[PDB]
């Protein structure tokens, strides 16, 4: 066991670093909810209405469902421990359509371009 005497980024109060990174993540979802992205990301904003498509096996495949509404909620509550976590659950729902739907299919194609803007948006992580 080794105690980290260097906390990477020494912050006053409690943990300024984590807050600044998560706030950037809020900036991301705020944009991903913007009407410009709503043209194609509309199915990801809210949990898919399974009745509408007439699926018969979402829970049988999708063991870790996530949606852009719920994820933002937890972010607003700041239950997220850092940026690594935020990126994980966003890619959760994106990869959900990927494994359950063939890569040439609609949702995964829409997610494909979301993944693009998302990847760049998450690349905007300052350290100091």
């Amino acid at each position: 066991k080794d105690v980290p005497d260097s906390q990477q980024h020494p912050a006053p109060e409690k943990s300024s670093k984590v807050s600044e990174q998560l706030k950037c993540c809020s900036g991301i979802l705020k944009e991903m909810f913007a009407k410009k992205h709503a043209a194609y990301a509309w199915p990801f904003y809210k949990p898919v209405d399974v009745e509408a498509l007439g699926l018969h096996d979402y829970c049988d495949i999708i063991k870790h469902p996530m949606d852009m509404s719920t994820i933002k909620s937890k972010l607003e509550a700041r239950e997220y421990r850092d940026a690594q976590e935020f990126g994980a659950d966003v890619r959760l729902m994106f990869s959900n359509c990927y494994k359950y739907n063939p890569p040439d299919h609609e949702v995964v194609a829409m997610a494909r371009k979301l993944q693009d803007v998302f990847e760049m948006r998450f690349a905007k992580m300052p350290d100091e």
């Binding site: 199915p43 007439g54 699926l55 096996d57 359509c97 739907n101 299919h105 949702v107």
Partner: peptide, 16 residues
Amino acid sequence: NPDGGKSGKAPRRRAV
């Protein structure tokens, strides 16, 4: 019915 995936989206116009 096309089960086993999300075969039922509204992209442009599912017709042709």
